[PDB]
């Protein structure tokens, strides 16, 4: 059921051409890192306070994704889905978080796996405070559990040193690349601490979710998340299309949910979750 569930939506996919004419701009080459992966125009991040003269300076590969199956008097968090960072690009995803007031970053990917590339760091060690672009960056601290770690950063503009936000990155580790964790449990654990730590926040941005490629890893976090959300407000009565959502969540980001493991690990990580919300309730 879930190979041909899973196809049926990758067949869908080869019809969802909306616009990704600034991502293909030659002038963006180098800050993407698969030429086939792109955001779409019309919910791309648009970077703020660049030169308009500077060709491509806007640019940056992610998309803003929200629950748009929702009604518009409901209420759920926005993401943003970023690839993650490549050494041109590092200063490009702390304008983002700076930008949209993110508090919360959330990694999904190590930044090296199997001796191939993921994603660059672009944190400071423990202690030491780095200048990217305009902002600094300082690493208040590491707190690790077995299979995730977080990060306490403060980040200022350079401009305006007195101005300190505190972020919070959450960074997954064993969640491979085209893969899937081994049991849900450690995704179910980091997506509570992360709810929690975004909702004890007034007014806070969008969370930042990436991987490497920004869709797989990312995609099928994301829609985990919105599932939990629904669930978490409407109670376990609630009509549960997991099919739908992932169709929904392409339609702001092409990709997202990149195997069918991936599509699987959803209802495996759903379905524990929908027994942990039962008994203690």
């Known amino acids: 059921g ?18 990704r004419l600034e991502g293909q701009r030659p002038e963006n ?8 992966i792109l955001p779409f125009d019309h919910s791309r991040v648009i970077l703020q306070g660049r030169d308009s003269n500077i060709p491509g300076s806007d640019y940056i590969n992610a998309n803003y994704i929200k629950n748009q199956l929702l009604g518009p008097d409901e209420n759920a968090k926005t993401y943003i889905a970023s690839q993650g960072c490549l050494e041109a690009t590092v200063n490009d995803f702390w304008q983002m978080a700076w930008q949209e007031n993110s508090r919360v970053i959330v990694m999904t990917t190590r930044e090296v796996e199997k001796g191939r590339n993921k994603c660059v760091p672009y944190w ?8 990217y672009g305009p902002y600094s960056v300082t690493n208040c601290g590491e707190h690790d559990t077995t299979e995730y770690k977080l990060r ?28 899937v964790p081994s049991e849900p449990g450690g995704v179910l654990s980091f997506l509570d601490q992360i709810n929690q730590r975004q909702e004890s926040l007034p007014h806070a941005g969008p969370i930042i979710v990436h991987s490497s490629a920004g ?8 829609v985990i998340d919105m599932l939990m959300e629904n669930i978490s407000t409407k109670g376990l009565d609630c009509d549960i299309d997991i099919q739908k959502t ?33 008994k203690k309730l």
């Open 29 to 36: 080459k180098g800050k993407n890192r698969y030429k086939n």
């Open 246 to 278: 992932i169709q929904m969540v392409r339609a702001q980001r092409s990709g997202m949910v990149q195997t069918e493991a991936q599509y699987k690990f959803i209802y495996v990580a759903i379905a524990q979750f929908i027994e942990t919300t039962k």
């Open 124 to 131: 400071p060690e423990v202690g030491m405070q780095r200048a």
């Open 2 to 19: 879930f190979w041909e569930e899973f196809e049926s939506l990758q067949k869908q996919e080869v019809k969802n051409l909306h616009q």
């Open 152 to 179: 306490t950063l403060q980040v200022s503009p350079l401009d305006n040193g007195d101005l300190i936000r505190e972020i919070w990155h959450y960074q997954y580790l064993s969640w491979p690349d085209h893969g």
């Open 215 to 222: 869709i797989g890893r990312t995609g099928t976090i994301i």
